[PDB]
Amino acid sequence: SYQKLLKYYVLNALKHRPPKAQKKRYLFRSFKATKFFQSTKLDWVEVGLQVCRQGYNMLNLLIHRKNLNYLHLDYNFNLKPVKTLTTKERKKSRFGNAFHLCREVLRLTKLVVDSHVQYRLGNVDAFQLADGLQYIFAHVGQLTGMYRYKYKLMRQIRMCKDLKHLI
């Protein structure tokens, strides 16, 4: 693990082209210059619950707009068929790597946010919250399945194991 982390450091240091000075772009400054955006201040757990609900709503609005009424996205971002599908329904409802990769990013964020929610409900602990987040960021390849829809994430996953052997 130490040898692999050294290799990662050397590959970071070697292919370092200089920052290539661009024109600054400021996406969130152009959003709040429009009339469609407001700004407030909120607890992090509340915004995380909001982001999980919004991503859930986006994904099953994409499901319900494609008339795929025989699929179900549960609240932990598993996509399951409600019934047994025909050949035509199975050829119709096959999603690509974009939908599934975004679904698994939302699964990882809901794991993190639900860890904070069960902290803020008084259900778990503070130390068990820290250990739960450490397990989440050490075991994404075992808790999500992001690797199936983009395989290059193994570069990340092995690295987390190296850090788990480092610490």
Partner: protein
């Protein structure tokens, strides 16, 4: 049951004489959050939030600039804890802007033609007696 504080130091001196009403305003806000929309229009259901937010901020503003009943420390505690709005107060201290609804109703980025809402037009300069309800706010004539 009350608002969870985020200071964790004890509140300042004159806290105990403004708390029944702050908690009563805070209980009033939790009513408006949970009202189901049925015969309330899409913009109309958010109007009580801006009214009660106006009321809480006006209450601390009256106790510090009019009645002089509160120190700087208790005043700035209520701003930090979210009982009063810092930006709404800073507009009420301006010259013409003294019964303002919202910060939406003077924001010129929020309108099509880059202007305030008709909320902010003096009722004598409408000269007709038309009835106004601002869509942002529900207001009938600040200015």
């Amino acid at each position: 049951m009350p608002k969870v504080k985020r200071s964790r130091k004890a509140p300042p001196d004159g806290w105990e004489l403004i708390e029944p009403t702050l908690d009563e305003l805070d209980q009033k806000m939790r009513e408006a959050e949970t009202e189901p929309h049925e015969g309330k229009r899409k913009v109309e259901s958010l109007w009580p939030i801006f009214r009660i937010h106006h009321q809480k901020t006006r209450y601390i503003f009256d106790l510090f600039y009019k009645r002089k009943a509160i120190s700087r420390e208790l005043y700035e505690y209520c701003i930090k804890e979210g009982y009063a709005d810092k930006n709404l107060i800073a507009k009420w201290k301006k010259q013409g802007y003294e019964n303002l609804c919202c910060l939406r109703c003077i924001q010129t980025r929020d309108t099509n033609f880059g202007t305030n809402c008709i909320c902010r037009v003096p009722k004598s300069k409408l000269e007709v007696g038309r009835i106004i309800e601002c869509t942002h706010c529900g207001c009938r004539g600040c200015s």
